[PDB]
Curated annotation (Swiss-Prot), chain B:
The modification Phosphotyrosine is found at Y213. Residues 1-224 are annotated as: Self-association. This is Estrogen receptor. A lipid is attached at C131 (S-palmitoyl cysteine). Composed of three domains: a modulating N-terminal domain, a DNA-binding domain and a C-terminal ligand-binding domain. The modulating domain, also known as A/B or AF-1 domain has a ligand-independent transactivation function. The C-terminus contains a ligand-dependent transactivation domain, also known as E/F or AF-2 domain which overlaps with the ligand binding domain. AF-1 and AF-2 activate transcription independently and synergistically and act in a promoter- and cell-specific manner. AF-1 seems to provide the major transactivation function in differentiated cells. It is found in: Nucleus; Golgi apparatus; Cell membrane. Nuclear hormone receptor. The steroid hormones and their receptors are involved in the regulation of eukaryotic gene expression and affect cellular proliferation and differentiation in target tissues. Ligand-dependent nuclear transactivation involves either direct homodimer binding to a palindromic estrogen response element (ERE) sequence or association with other DNA-binding transcription factors, such as AP-1/c-Jun, c-Fos, ATF-2, Sp1 and Sp3, to mediate ERE-independent signaling. Phosphorylated by cyclin A/CDK2 and CK1. Phosphorylation probably enhances transcriptional activity. Self-association induces phosphorylation. Phosphorylated by LMTK3 in vitro. Binds DNA as a homodimer. Can form a heterodimer with ESR2. Interacts with FOXC2, MAP1S, SLC30A9, UBE1C and NCOA3 coactivator. Interacts with PELP1, the interaction is enhanced by 17-beta-estradiol, the interaction increases ESR1 transcriptional activity. Interacts with EP300; the interaction is estrogen-dependent and enhanced by CITED1. Interacts with CITED1; the interaction is estrogen-dependent. Interacts with NCOA5 and NCOA6 coactivators. Interacts with NCOA7; the interaction is a ligand-inducible. Interacts with PHB2, and UBE1C. Interacts with AKAP13. Interacts with CUEDC2. The lineage of its organism: Eukaryota, Metazoa, Chordata, Craniata, Vertebrata. Residues 5-223 form the NR LBD domain. Widely expressed. Not expressed in the pituitary gland.
Amino acid sequence: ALSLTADQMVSALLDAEPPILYSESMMGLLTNLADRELVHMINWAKRVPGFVDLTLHDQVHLLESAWLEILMIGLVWRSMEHPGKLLFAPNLLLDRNQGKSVEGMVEIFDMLLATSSRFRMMNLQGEEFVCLKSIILLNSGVYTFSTLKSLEEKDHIHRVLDKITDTLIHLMAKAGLTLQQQHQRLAQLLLILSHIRHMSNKGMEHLPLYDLLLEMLDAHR
Amino acid sequence: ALSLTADQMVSALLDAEPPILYSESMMGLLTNLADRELVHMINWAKRVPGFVDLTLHDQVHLLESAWLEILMIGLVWRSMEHPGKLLFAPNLLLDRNQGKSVEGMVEIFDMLLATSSRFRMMNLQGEEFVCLKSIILLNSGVYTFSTLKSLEEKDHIHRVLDKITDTLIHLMAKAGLTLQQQHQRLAQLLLILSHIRHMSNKGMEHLYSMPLYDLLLEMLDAHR
Ligand SMILES: Oc1ccc2c(c1)CCN(c1ccccc1)[C@@H]2c1ccc(N2CCN3CCCC[C@H]3C2)cc1
Ligand SMILES: Oc1ccc2c(c1)CCN(c1ccccc1)[C@@H]2c1ccc(N2CCN3CCCC[C@H]3C2)cc1
């Protein structure tokens, strides 16, 4: 995981991508969809290089912090060449007007559209996207875990995150961006993660979970 | 503003730094302190390179999204040398015992400590801190503004952000960090901003249940 080339990390991440799921009241549909996405997110996480070095208990706490942001970054990714619209599933596409029954998601809806438009303008690549999704998984919960060794289990998370930063920069050098453009784009991308956090907390207010993730993360062949 | 050097950007920000204010019910003392800090943050915000270039309403929008993250990162910065404690004021230092008696503080107290101790482990420099703050100001509100004119204002904000990113990097080079170390530290800092947005969202949920656009509108006009 520390030992991977920047290229094997990208390849490991591309090839771990979850499938795009189909749709099956509006909030019923979205809830059914998300709940099925969750199962696949657990499988993706276990293949994020470095995640499975962690203790089971730290894997749960990280996924518990991060799961909504992960569904959102997904959604925004597949909505990208779909201006004005959210592609929840290839058979459930909603325009701005169609959050006109689900009160509340109206703030969120516009926030996701804006995130999607931003990825569009930046010309966000899939290799970059899987790097950013991996950072959310490692980061969202890292500041919310302190015996001494405890802090050593945190340090490894930060080693892996540095390793994903090296990877994003490597992909940027490869495409021939200057050292200055490299730094600027990396920052633009990391700053968008502030906004995805904001969206998840507003989403959480509008929406135990530990057991559910713990049972799912623990699977018998 | 886009003409600035890294060093001149730094000098502008350092010069614009608000003073550290004193405390005069614990929630009562904190409200009164943050309310007086808010006047100084307008003064500071007006001297962030690129901020006065924006329309009045864009300026209000940004301060509306950011002000509480700006109070928290200031808090966390002056708290760096006080493990277990939050230095709200030089005469108002709270530890965990006081911290559980303050409503709204109960979720965020440990998040604030963690941020402080993280800045403490990383040895954040004052030149780095003033850059992260300006970034918060220009970034927090930038994806919750769709006209052609709005597209041009967001373009500006994003160009000003690229020049603060440049300044952060220049500073790390100067301090002798390798290129790798430079990117790595850039990301670690920008990732902590994500946690500062989390704590603001949490803190905000409490403060809103205890009109801001119009108060900051009148404060930016009063600065005239
Ligand atoms: O890919 C998706 C799928 C669904 C959603 C999003 C992306 C992004 C936006 N989101 C949302 C969040 C809050 C309010 C309105 C919409 C829905 C979504 C809907 C429901 C859920 N939940 C419902 C309950 N269930 C509880 C068990 C754990 C998972 C959780 C998922 C998650 C996301
Ligand atoms: O530098 C400071 C000063 C005070 C505070 C912080 C940093 C960081 C955390 N914070 C807080 C947050 C939630 C619950 C309890 C305390 C207090 C703080 C207290 C009050 C306010 N408010 C009170 C009401 N007032 C309403 C008018 C607009 C400004 C707003 C400021 C802001 C921060």
